[PDB]
Scaffold this active site. Sequence first.
Site, PDB file in Angstrom:
ATOM      1  N   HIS A  13       8.117  -0.618   9.101  1.00  0.00           N
ATOM      2  CA  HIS A  13       7.297   0.583   9.170  1.00  0.00           C
ATOM      3  C   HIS A  13       8.132   1.823   9.506  1.00  0.00           C
ATOM      4  CE1 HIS A  13       4.376   3.391  11.079  1.00  0.00           C
ATOM      5  NE2 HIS A  13       3.506   2.875  10.228  1.00  0.00           N
ATOM      6  N   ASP A  20       1.115  15.546   9.666  1.00  0.00           N
ATOM      7  CA  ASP A  20       2.198  14.672  10.099  1.00  0.00           C
ATOM      8  C   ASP A  20       3.366  15.524  10.573  1.00  0.00           C
ATOM      9  OD1 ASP A  20       3.579  12.137  10.556  1.00  0.00           O
ATOM     10  OD2 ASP A  20       2.506  11.346   8.808  1.00  0.00           O
ATOM     11  N   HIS A  58      -1.658  11.981  11.601  1.00  0.00           N
ATOM     12  CA  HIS A  58      -0.754  10.843  11.445  1.00  0.00           C
ATOM     13  C   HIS A  58       0.441  10.879  12.398  1.00  0.00           C
ATOM     14  CE1 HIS A  58       1.442   7.811   8.722  1.00  0.00           C
ATOM     15  NE2 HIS A  58       0.309   7.240   9.090  1.00  0.00           N
ATOM     16  N   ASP A  78       9.977  -0.438  13.787  1.00  0.00           N
ATOM     17  CA  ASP A  78       9.883   1.010  13.826  1.00  0.00           C
ATOM     18  C   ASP A  78      11.151   1.599  14.442  1.00  0.00           C
ATOM     19  OD1 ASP A  78       7.337   2.037  12.694  1.00  0.00           O
ATOM     20  OD2 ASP A  78       6.416   0.668  14.126  1.00  0.00           O
TER      21      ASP A  78
HETATM   22  C1  LIG Z   1      -1.764  -4.556  10.328  1.00  0.00           C
HETATM   23  C2  LIG Z   1      -0.896  -4.429  11.571  1.00  0.00           C
HETATM   24  C3  LIG Z   1       0.201  -3.425  11.266  1.00  0.00           C
HETATM   25  C4  LIG Z   1      -0.431  -2.058  11.014  1.00  0.00           C
HETATM   26  O1  LIG Z   1      -1.195  -1.599  11.794  1.00  0.00           O
HETATM   27  O2  LIG Z   1      -0.109  -1.355   9.857  1.00  0.00           O
HETATM   28  C5  LIG Z   1      -0.382   0.017   9.868  1.00  0.00           C
HETATM   29  C6  LIG Z   1       0.352   0.571   8.651  1.00  0.00           C
HETATM   30  C7  LIG Z   1       0.197   2.071   8.579  1.00  0.00           C
HETATM   31  O3  LIG Z   1       0.381   2.489   9.891  1.00  0.00           O
HETATM   32  P1  LIG Z   1       0.157   4.097  10.151  1.00  0.00           P
HETATM   33  O4  LIG Z   1       1.185   4.837   9.321  1.00  0.00           O
HETATM   34  O5  LIG Z   1      -1.255   4.407   9.705  1.00  0.00           O
HETATM   35  O6  LIG Z   1       0.343   4.446  11.599  1.00  0.00           O
HETATM   36  O7  LIG Z   1      -0.211   0.029   7.507  1.00  0.00           O
HETATM   37  C8  LIG Z   1       0.548  -1.027   7.014  1.00  0.00           C
HETATM   38  O8  LIG Z   1       1.702  -1.095   7.313  1.00  0.00           O
HETATM   39  C9  LIG Z   1      -0.142  -2.068   6.130  1.00  0.00           C
HETATM   40  C10 LIG Z   1      -0.539  -1.475   4.788  1.00  0.00           C
HETATM   41  C11 LIG Z   1      -1.037  -2.539   3.809  1.00  0.00           C
END
Ligand SMILES: CCCC(=O)OC[C@H](COP(=O)(O)O)OC(=O)CCC
Length: 501
Positions: free
Chosen positions: A165, A197, A439, A464
Site C-alpha cells: 500500500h 489528498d 484521503h 506502508d
Molecule cells: C482490506 C484491508 C486492507 C485495506 O484496508 O485496504 C485499503 C486499501 C485502500 O486504502 P486507502 O487508500 O483507502 O486508505 O484498499 C486496498 O488496498 C484493497 C483494494 C481492493
Amino acid sequence: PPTPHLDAIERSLRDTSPGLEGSVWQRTDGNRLDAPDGDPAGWLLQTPGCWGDAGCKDRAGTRRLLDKMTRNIADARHTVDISSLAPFPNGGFEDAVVDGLKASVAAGHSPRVRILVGAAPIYHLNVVPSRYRDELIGKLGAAAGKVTLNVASMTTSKTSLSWNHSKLLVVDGKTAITGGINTNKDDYLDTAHPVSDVDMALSGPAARSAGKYLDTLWDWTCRNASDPAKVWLATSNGASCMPSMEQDEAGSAPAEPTGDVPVIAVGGLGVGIKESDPSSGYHPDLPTAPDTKCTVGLHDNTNADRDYDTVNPEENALRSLIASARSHVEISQQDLNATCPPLPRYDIRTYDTLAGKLAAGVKVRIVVSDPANRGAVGSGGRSQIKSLDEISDTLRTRLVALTGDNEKASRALCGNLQLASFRSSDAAKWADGKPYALHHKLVSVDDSAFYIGSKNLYPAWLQDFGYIVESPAAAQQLKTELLDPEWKYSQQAAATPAGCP
Ligand SMILES: CCCC(=O)OC[C@H](COP(=O)(O)O)OC(=O)CCC
C-alpha cells in the site's frame, strides 16, 4: 536544534524493531523539503488544491504534483523506484513516468526502473505486469532500449489481507515523493468530485532511506516470483530482477546532506514478508480491551500480535508521535476506524493515547472523511463509519476505563476534543452534489513534528511507508497551507458528542 518529538519516536522504534533500522526505518539529518524557488511551501503537494472553491475550476494542485513527478524523473541519472496500490500508474501519472524517462534517456542516461504495486486477492488486475511493461515500452519509443524495467504486482498474505500500500517515487536514491495519492486516474484526475489528498517532496539522506525500504520489498518480491500466486513479474530487455537496486546506487559513501531537516523514515512489512525481528527484545503489555459490537474473526495483528509490531515499526511510530504531543495534535485521515469484520474496528493503543491526551488537557482534533462517503473496499475517500459518534463514543469508553468515572471523561471529551468530517470550502458538498472525500494519512503535533505518508491510522496490515519531520518552520507551513484551512471549513461539519454542551 533540539528534536524532542523525533527522540521519543526513535526510542520507540529502536525498542520495537532494532533489527529493521536502516532498512524499514531510519532517522537522518540533512534533508531538504524540496520546494521550487519562489514557493517555499511547495514541498507540500496537496490535491486537488482548491481551498474555499466549491466548484474547483482550476485543479492546480494536481498539476503541480504531476509536474513535480515528471521533473524528478526527468532528472534521473541512474534509478527510478515507484510503488503504489494497484493498478499500475495510468493517466497523467503514466505520462509523468513516460515523459520523465524519455528526458532522462535524452540526457544520455540508462535508468533502471522498478514499478511495484500491491494487489488485493479479490481485486482483478486489468493490466498485468507484462501488459503494463509493453505499454511502457511502446510509449517510450526508441528510448525503451536504454531503460531497464522491473514491473511487478504482489500479494504477501491472502489470509491476513496484506499487500503493498506504499506510495513512493524515489529517484537516484536522493529525491523522494510520498504521501497518500494513488497514481491512479479516476481518483484525482477525471471527475468533478476529486478526492482530497496530500503528498510531500524531500531530498537528502531520507530519500535513500525510502530507497532501502523499497529494496526490502523487492528482495521479497524477486524471491517470491517463484510463487506466481504471490508475485507476477515482468522485466524488459532480458534484464534480471533487481532486488537491491537502491543499495547498488548508494555505494559505500553515506548520503550527502541537502538541507537541515531531520526526518524519520518508517515503513512496515505487513504480513508474510518477515515473521518477526529476530533481534528485537520488545515485550509489551498488550491491551485487554473488548469492543462494543465487533469481534475480529481473523487474528488481530493490530491489537494482539507482538511479532507484527516488530516488523511494522510504523504502527508504534504513529502512536509515539501522538504520545509525544505536549500541547495539541491534529489527525487528518480518511478514517480512524476500520470495517469490522474483516479487520478490527480500531487500534486500541492509539485510542488509549488519544484518551490520555484528552485527560491531560492536550487539544485533540480529528477530521475524517464524511460518513456519507460510501465506497467499495478500496475506493479512496470512502468512510468506514456510519457516524462520527463511533469515534467520540470510543474515546469516551477508553476515557472512562482510564479516569474511572464518566463525568471526568466528559470534561476531557467535551473540553479538549474537536471532531469533524472534511470540507474544503463553505459548501457542504461539491457543487457536483456528491460529498467531499478525504484521503489524508496525516498527523501533526505541537506545530513541530508531523507524519505524511501512506499509513492510515485505521487498522490495516499492508506494507506502508512515510516520513516524520521535526521542524517548527515546516510545521508552520503545514499549519498555514493545510491544517488551518481544513479546520476553517470542516468545523461547519463538526460533531458535538453525546453528553456535551
Ligand atoms: C482490506 C484491508 C486492507 C485495506 O484496508 O485496504 C485499503 C486499501 C485502500 O486504502 P486507502 O487508500 O483507502 O486508505 O484498499 C486496498 O488496498 C484493497 C483494494 C481492493
